[PDB]
Amino acid sequence: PVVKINAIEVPAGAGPELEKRFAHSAHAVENSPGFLGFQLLRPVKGEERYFVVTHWESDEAFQAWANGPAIAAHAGHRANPVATGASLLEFEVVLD
Amino acid sequence: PVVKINAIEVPAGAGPELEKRFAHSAHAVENSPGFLGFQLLRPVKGEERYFVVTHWESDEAFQAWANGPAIAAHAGHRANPVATGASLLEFEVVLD
Ligand SMILES: C=CC1=C(C)/C(=C/c2[nH]c(/C=C3N=C(/C=C4\NC(=O)C(C)=C4C=C)C(C)=C\3CCC(=O)O)c(CCC(=O)O)c2C)NC1=O
Ligand SMILES: C=CC1=C(C)/C(=C/c2[nH]c(/C=C3N=C(/C=C4\NC(=O)C(C)=C4C=C)C(C)=C\3CCC(=O)O)c(CCC(=O)O)c2C)NC1=O
Ligand SMILES: C=CC1=C(C)/C(=C/c2[nH]c(/C=C3N=C(/C=C4\NC(=O)C(C)=C4C=C)C(C)=C\3CCC(=O)O)c(CCC(=O)O)c2C)NC1=O
Ligand SMILES: C=CC1=C(C)/C(=C/c2[nH]c(/C=C3N=C(/C=C4\NC(=O)C(C)=C4C=C)C(C)=C\3CCC(=O)O)c(CCC(=O)O)c2C)NC1=O
Ligand SMILES: C=CC1=C(C)/C(=C/c2[nH]c(/C=C3N=C(/C=C4\NC(=O)C(C)=C4C=C)C(C)=C\3CCC(=O)O)c(CCC(=O)O)c2C)NC1=O
């Protein structure tokens, strides 16, 4: 499988907000094909960015999400966004 | 009216590609409400970024585009993008 990590940047004190958005909004992509579920990681030390860690059977699994329903997902939340940045770190799973 | 300028960053030699996309690939949003048409500016000196200069009757006119049909527009082109960056510079038209 592959892993996509998204380092999301959130101004101070808006992590609860960004958190309520994964909960009280649309945490729904677990029926995307090849999706193996994600973790949302709140930073405590070494870090100030939220990490979204997602596993997938393949990269084509990932691209089905990104290049399909993601471009149009969560329009309102992205029209009024709480995040101020992101980076997509992309890996191959070599051990477990 | 207001003016939104988008400094699009494009790697070397892909300005023709980004140009075919504004021409032969859906240059169409001139019937978006409050839209007053755009110019696409190819840089020659002082600059390496393409500028998209758009005028609008109001910012709400602009937001109708961005927060409406733009989050879902040109999906394929954004799935295979030729640009590597952008910035939204926003102004009020004070003289003309
Ligand atoms: C649709 C999927 C989508 C794609 C393909 C996408 C591409 C994309 N967005 C970026 C930044 C960014 N993109 C946005 C926001 C948006 N960008 C948009 O295309 C839309 C609709 C919004 C909605 C508000 C912001 C706020 C940044 C960073 C700006 C900053 O860091 O200040 C960057 C990199 C900036 C850089 O590296 O120089 C890329 C490649 N962003 C997306 O959300
Ligand atoms: C593929 C892994 C992945 C998944 C499945 C995912 C789901 C997801 N991303 C969210 C926020 C977000 N998601 C992104 C960016 C992205 N979202 C993407 O799917 C991709 C590929 C990017 C860009 C790298 C950003 C910037 C936010 C904060 C949105 C906000 O400000 O409210 C939310 C909260 C709703 C919201 O605020 O809009 C969910 C449920 N995010 C991920 O990163
Ligand atoms: C909320 C859910 C959300 C989703 C699902 C989303 C989709 C999304 N964001 C992307 C890139 C991107 N999107 C952003 C940032 C943003 N994009 C925005 O819509 C906003 C508001 C921001 C800013 C907070 C950045 C910076 C990238 C490029 C990430 C990178 O490659 O480093 C991409 C292209 C990823 C790829 O294939 O490489 C997608 C599909 N953007 C979202 O925000
Ligand atoms: C301001 C009004 C505005 C309009 C009406 C507009 C239209 C427009 N933008 C395009 C490319 C693009 N448009 C953007 C970004 C944006 N597009 C937006 O409407 C906004 C608000 C942003 C972000 C600030 C980028 C990054 C490209 C290059 C896409 C590519 O690499 O193919 C294209 C070419 C098709 C494509 O490549 O997808 C058109 C016709 N661009 C603008 O900037
Ligand atoms: C092609 C047509 C296209 C459209 C119509 C589009 C819409 C779009 N891009 C946006 C931000 C943004 N979009 C990008 C960049 C990208 N976004 C991408 O989809 C890709 C591939 C890149 C990078 C090459 C960036 C960097 C911002 C934030 C610009 C800023 O706020 O200064 C926004 C929010 C603008 C705002 O209200 O602040 C919209 C509506 N993005 C597009 O690319």
Curated annotation (Swiss-Prot), chains A, B:
Presence of keyword Metal-binding: yes
Gene3D superfamilies per UniProt: 3.30.70.100
Pfam families: ABM (PF03992)
ABM domain: residues covered: 2-91
Record-level GO BP terms: heme catabolic process
Protein's job: Catalyzes the oxidative degradation of the heme macrocyclic porphyrin ring in the presence of a suitable electron donor such as ascorbate or NADPH--cytochrome P450 reductase, with subsequent release of free iron.
Gene that encodes it: mhuD
GO cellular component, one term: peptidoglycan-based cell wall
Naturally occurring in which organism (per UniProt): Mycobacterium tuberculosis (strain ATCC 25618 / H37Rv)
Disulphide bridges, residue numbers: none
Protein name per the record: Heme oxygenase (mycobilin-producing)
Family affiliation: Belongs to the antibiotic biosynthesis monooxygenase family.
Record bears the keyword Iron: yes
